[PDB]
């Protein structure tokens, strides 16, 4: 009863590394967006929508592992 | 006189012989060892000009020079098979780093006073981020206080320990084994390699120490 909860906590802790890639990826998408806007001021109206779409996509990718950790903790 | 005392007196004797005894009659020719000393002086003086120059580099050049020669003579006696790393405590380098950081802070508080606290805010970082900036820079300076010692001392001790462990683990080099061919002589090759590595590392880290203390002195005297 104690061991299973302990391993649940361990699994949540090792799952928390899943958001590392999500953060790095969201930020690299934003970085490429900024570079593209700087190298082409008139392309903002085009780059902004798919930039936000990729942000949300990577955020959902990270939130998958975040929810896995949450269900490991409280389930 | 302990081991450290005799090591230091021998170091002082050899270092003073390298200058006052190199000159047979102190001619103007500037012989090969004389020209080597001249090159070292010129190099340290242009560290000073490049990294702390602009009003008062010359005043602070001599400590750079003396620390460079002390570290040079310490690193030169590091690879001799008997050579002991100055009693093998290396806390001396930590003490040097601490005293140099303390002197730099005293100089900053003397020539600037309360303005030294403005060094934590170089260009921007307004009030919402001011405490974070000052904490970060204070911790960076605290790390700088230990950077110099835990650097040269660490590398010297690590080199000596690698030396000892390598020599210990190849004690069967041609004692009893039958496979002592060039494959068994490869450990001698790695020992030779670490000889060269320790020499180059000692020299380049003496240069590292010189440039680091020059940069610290510039940061102390000049606020940016």
């Amino acid at each position: 009863m104690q061991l299973v909860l302990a391993a649940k906590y361990i699994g949540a802790g090792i799952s928390t590394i899943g958001l590392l890639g999500a953060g790095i990826g969201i930020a690299i998408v934003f970085a490429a967006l900024i570079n593209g806007v700087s190298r082409n001021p008139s392309i903002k109206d085009t780059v902004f929508p798919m930039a936000i779409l990729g942000f949300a996509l990577s955020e959902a990718t990270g939130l998958f592992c975040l929810m896995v950790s949450f269900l490991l903790l409280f389930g | 006189l302990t081991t450290f005392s005799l090591y230091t007196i021998i170091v002082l004797l050899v270092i003073t012989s390298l200058y006052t005894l190199t000159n047979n009659n102190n001619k103007i020719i500037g012989s090969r060892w004389l020209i080597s000393q001249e090159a070292i002086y010129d190099t340290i003086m242009n560290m000073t000009k490049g990294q702390i120059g602009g009003k008062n580099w010359g005043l602070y050049f001599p400590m750079i020079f003396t620390l460079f020669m002390f570290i040079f003579i310490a690193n030169l006696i590091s690879m001799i098979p008997y050579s002991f790393a100055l009693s093998a405590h290396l806390v001396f380098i930590i003490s040097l780093s601490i005293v140099i950081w303390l002197g730099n802070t005293i100089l900053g508080l003397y020539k600037h006073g309360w303005v030294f606290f403005s060094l934590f805010v170089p260009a921007g970082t307004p009030l919402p981020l001011v405490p974070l900036l000052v904490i970060i820079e204070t911790l960076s300076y605290f790390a700088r206080a230990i950077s110099l010692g835990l650097r040269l001392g660490s590398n010297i001790l690590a080199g000596h320990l690698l030396m000892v462990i390598l020599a210990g683990l190849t004690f069967n080099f041609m004692l009893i084994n039958l496979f002592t061919l060039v494959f068994g002589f490869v450990p001698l090759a790695m020992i030779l390699a670490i000889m060269m590595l320790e020499f180059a590392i000692g020299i380049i880290q003496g240069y590292v120490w010189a440039i680091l203390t020059a940069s610290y002195l510039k940061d102390a005297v000049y606020l940016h």
């Binding site: 700087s38 190298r39 082409n40 001021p41 008139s42 392309i43 | -």
Partner: protein
């Protein structure tokens, strides 16, 4: 400014000078830049490729012979070209193919000429691609 002005000039007869224009393809060494309007100032070496120029009339293809795709903050697109591709009247398969195969034998003649014959055949193959 509204829109984009393009300054297309040729040694025989200049084509465009300060004329309102939308997106124009500018094939460079890396790739073509579809400058819509304004745009950051740039300097890119143009490579033989299709320069497609949109106006309100139609979409006319102009296979360029080279130049520079240089822009200014005042949105001045001065493309200093040499030879253009007026509509498709310049298209001719046979002369391009025979010139390519005839410059292949002299593609290794003498140093500079040998190296430049390969580039001439490359731009001839680009002409073949533009032939449609």
């Amino acid at each position: 400014s509204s829109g984009l002005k393009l300054q297309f000039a040729l040694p025989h007869e200049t084509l465009y000078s300060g004329s309102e224009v939308t997106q124009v393809n500018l094939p460079a060494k890396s790739g073509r830049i579809g400058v819509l309007a304004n745009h950051v100032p740039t300097v890119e070496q143009l490579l033989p490729g299709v320069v497609e120029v949109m106006e309100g009339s139609n979409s006319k293809k102009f296979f360029i012979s080279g130049g520079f795709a240089t822009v200014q903050p005042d949105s001045q697109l001065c493309v200093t070209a040499i030879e253009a591709f007026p509509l498709e009247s310049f298209s001719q398969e046979n002369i391009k193919n025979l010139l390519a195969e005839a410059k292949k034998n002299v593609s290794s003649s003498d140093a500079r000429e040998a190296a430049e014959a390969a580039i001439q055949v490359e731009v001839l193959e680009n002409l073949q691609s533009v032939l449609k």
